[PDB]
Amino acid sequence: RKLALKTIDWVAFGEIIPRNQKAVANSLKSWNETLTSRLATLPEKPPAIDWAYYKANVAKAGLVDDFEKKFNALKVPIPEDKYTAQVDAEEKEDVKSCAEFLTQSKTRIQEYEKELEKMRN
Amino acid sequence: EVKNRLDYHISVQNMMRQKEQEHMINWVEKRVVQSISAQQEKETIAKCIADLKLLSKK
């Protein structure tokens, strides 16, 4: 498993953030840099066990059979969420970055650009 | 984490078999040997192969 599917560019996230979090982005960038590099290394999982070999060749062949029906049944989970509240914070921070600031910016850039049509006089 | 658990057993059965082998072997050899010469025929099998040297290396 590689980087989580969503990829935003490393300079477009990494220059710009709300004023409330301004210094925390440049740290969180480096924290996500070490995590994305640290996770990109790993073969996700080992091989299986050759069982008929292990049962023949460990001459304690009945200790072996416990560990078959145990290991063949005993399956590992992937770790869970605890911080996808960053996606709700991202929808709220897009309502802020887009809609709230976008429409407010479109009336303020127009406040100047309508004064630039007045400056044509 | 599983593997270590099987491998003791193997590795012990390997070491054990050698330690039975050497101890069997040593005790075994150290008991029986002597009666061999009272077969003079262990020097007759020397003479036998030796007469099949003595004809049959010439």
XYZ file of C-alpha atoms in Angstrom:
179
model
C 0.000 0.000 0.000
C 1.443 3.316 -1.029
C 0.565 6.847 -0.194
C -3.112 7.275 0.574
C -4.940 7.770 -2.713
C -5.495 11.541 -2.309
C -2.469 13.389 -3.501
C -2.236 17.133 -3.407
C 0.940 18.782 -4.560
C 3.742 19.236 -2.075
C 4.200 22.985 -2.825
C 0.464 23.845 -3.172
C -0.203 22.455 0.391
C 3.242 23.407 1.626
C 3.466 27.219 1.051
C -0.113 28.199 2.042
C -2.519 27.562 4.966
C -5.007 29.627 7.153
C -3.450 32.299 9.402
C -4.526 30.323 12.562
C -2.267 27.330 11.622
C 0.487 29.202 9.652
C 3.663 27.867 11.382
C 2.162 24.336 11.905
C 1.942 23.571 8.118
C 5.726 23.786 7.559
C 6.205 21.269 10.445
C 3.279 18.978 9.371
C 4.746 18.975 5.796
C 8.060 17.533 7.144
C 6.098 15.118 9.430
C 4.096 13.854 6.409
C 7.425 13.811 4.368
C 9.031 11.395 6.857
C 5.784 9.300 6.975
C 5.296 9.044 3.153
C 8.994 8.106 2.636
C 8.926 5.732 5.695
C 5.803 3.916 4.366
C 6.915 3.800 0.664
C 9.792 1.369 1.606
C 7.811 -1.606 2.875
C 6.790 -4.890 1.157
C 3.345 -5.100 2.655
C 3.560 -8.497 4.259
C 5.919 -11.389 4.361
C 5.455 -14.621 2.314
C 3.154 -17.394 3.555
C 4.571 -20.558 5.252
C 5.130 -23.735 3.198
C 3.167 -25.971 5.481
C 3.684 -29.509 4.100
C 7.432 -28.770 4.312
C 7.220 -27.460 7.930
C 5.066 -30.533 8.949
C 7.462 -33.038 7.323
C 10.781 -31.352 8.242
C 10.158 -30.280 11.876
C 10.302 -33.873 13.218
C 8.071 -32.751 16.172
C 5.371 -33.030 13.440
C 2.319 -32.814 15.841
C 3.406 -29.500 17.502
C 3.478 -28.302 13.889
C -0.262 -29.121 13.129
C -1.515 -26.833 16.031
C 0.313 -23.904 14.449
C -1.308 -24.718 10.989
C -4.956 -24.628 11.967
C -4.099 -21.692 14.267
C -1.998 -19.639 11.691
C -4.368 -20.458 8.752
C -7.341 -19.192 10.861
C -5.463 -16.352 12.694
C -5.781 -13.296 10.401
C -4.318 -9.781 10.929
C -6.326 -6.457 10.701
C -5.147 -3.209 9.077
C -5.036 -0.292 11.635
C -8.176 1.861 11.930
C -9.067 5.558 11.620
C -8.646 8.053 14.451
C -8.097 11.382 12.570
C -10.234 11.505 9.356
C -11.763 14.527 11.148
C -9.012 16.172 8.973
C -11.466 15.559 5.983
C -14.311 17.415 7.871
C -11.768 20.111 8.803
C -10.800 20.070 5.048
C -14.467 20.540 3.900
C -14.835 23.401 6.467
C -11.410 24.812 5.415
C -12.514 24.629 1.695
C -15.805 26.462 2.601
C -13.349 29.051 4.068
C -10.666 28.956 1.256
C -13.212 28.651 -1.538
C -16.753 29.975 -0.826
C -16.333 32.411 2.195
C -13.041 33.950 0.982
C -13.755 33.442 -2.791
C -17.060 35.433 -2.906
C -15.738 38.035 -0.391
C -12.577 38.322 -2.559
C -14.763 38.655 -5.718
C -16.555 41.675 -4.175
C -13.222 43.213 -2.869
C -11.231 42.720 -6.150
C -14.321 44.245 -7.834
C -14.253 47.146 -5.275
C -10.801 48.039 -6.707
C -11.580 47.007 -10.374
C -14.845 49.075 -10.358
C -12.657 51.919 -9.046
C -10.305 51.070 -12.006
C -13.282 51.628 -14.378
C -13.721 54.907 -12.402
C -9.918 55.549 -12.883
C -10.574 55.293 -16.687
C -12.101 58.628 -15.725
C 6.869 -14.920 15.864
C 5.435 -18.388 15.004
C 8.663 -19.749 13.518
C 10.826 -19.758 16.599
C 8.272 -22.152 18.042
C 8.644 -24.918 15.584
C 12.348 -24.431 15.052
C 13.414 -25.350 18.614
C 11.905 -28.658 18.094
C 13.581 -29.356 14.832
C 16.891 -28.051 15.983
C 16.710 -30.035 19.208
C 15.735 -33.225 17.311
C 18.801 -32.562 15.069
C 21.189 -31.995 18.036
C 19.563 -34.882 19.980
C 20.028 -37.325 17.166
C 23.751 -36.410 16.988
C 24.085 -36.707 20.744
C 22.347 -40.187 20.557
C 24.575 -40.976 17.533
C 27.886 -40.040 19.292
C 26.852 -41.606 22.584
C 25.410 -44.765 20.991
C 28.454 -44.827 18.709
C 31.052 -44.270 21.463
C 29.429 -46.715 23.921
C 28.713 -49.171 21.157
C 32.320 -49.185 19.853
C 33.741 -49.145 23.391
C 31.728 -52.254 24.361
C 32.079 -54.603 21.408
C 35.313 -54.838 19.630
C 37.503 -57.400 21.174
C 36.043 -60.754 19.996
C 37.142 -59.776 16.452
C 40.679 -61.372 16.734
C 39.347 -64.646 18.080
C 38.193 -64.586 14.559
C 41.647 -65.397 13.239
C 39.493 -64.996 10.098
C 39.867 -61.205 10.375
C 43.440 -61.950 9.509
C 42.222 -64.656 7.121
C 40.146 -61.900 5.396
C 43.445 -59.977 5.451
C 45.097 -63.164 3.977
C 42.100 -63.606 1.545
C 42.213 -60.098 0.132
C 45.995 -60.391 0.596
C 46.064 -63.601 -1.650
C 43.946 -61.500 -4.075
C 46.522 -58.926 -3.663
C 49.314 -61.406 -3.815
C 47.860 -63.040 -7.081
C 45.640 -60.097 -8.042
C 47.900 -56.906 -7.733
C 50.666 -58.629 -9.903
